């Protein structure tokens, strides 16, 4: 209570423990805390089990806290949001068995180089997954099979060279897909299925414009109003779409949706 800032009234009880050189969870915290901020601390190691006493905790922010090892012990039955962004995790924590009600997971800007087969098992309620700014080169097929309710997916600014065929199949609620600034060369045929994807970011990739890019070319033409350019700190309020941002070899004068495709089968 005295160490961190507390704010109550209606909605819930938010506890702010940011920037306090904390190396562990303060033993002095309101048992009814619903939102806990532990950002900007020195949590090289942290154990989720230490939060079990706080039964109403629905949001936990452990971002920018030098997090290196996250111990996933017991169970936090009502935790809905977990922010682990801007930390030093080299492996994705396996959270399914501990955070069954999780809807938002942010592990952006960590040190991930790959994702395991078990990755998202058990996170059936997941709605937002952010993995921007890591160094992923490829994704396991079936990565998103445990998360059919996904609405937002961010794989921006990684090192992806290709996407698994079928990655989006089954995601009938997907509204935002961020894939900008990777090393993507093509899009698997039928990748987007028959689902309407309102916000897609595909710029900053060295698209290879050959006959294999024709599926993507047609999709871009049919979805020109759903393609956008990312702008830090700004909501896609009504931001003007810009299909021309998706370019062959990331060359400004050669947008993929204008690629002629000379010498290519129908
Ligand atoms: C994941 O993706 C990251 C983003 O592309 C990537 O980071 C880039 O890495 C390259 C290679 O290390 C960086 O390029 C070098 O930059 C330094 C300083 O800016 C230059 O001195 C250096 O000189 C050139 O090196 C060439 C060989 O690579 C050589 O042929 C040239 O003659 C010349 O000597 C490079 O230009 C680049 O800046 C990084 N980008 C950023 C924004 O950090 C990661 O390496 C990649 N991760 C993995 C695992 O591949």
Swiss-Prot record:
Residues bearing carbohydrate: 21, 159
Coiled coil residues, start to end: none
Listed result of changing residue 156 to V: In BSS and BSSA2
Superkingdom, natural source: Eukaryota
Residues covered by the LRRCT domain: 205-266
Disulfide bonds: 4-17, 209-248, 211-264
Domain annotation LRRNT: ranges: 1-31
LRR-type repeats, residues: 32-52, 56-77, 78-99, 101-121, 125-146, 149-170, 173-194
Consequence recorded when altering residue 239 to V: In VWDP; increased binding to vWF
The protein's name in its UniProt record: Glycocalicin
Organism, as annotated: Homo sapiens
Record gene name: GP1BA
Parent-protein residues present: 17 to 282 of 652
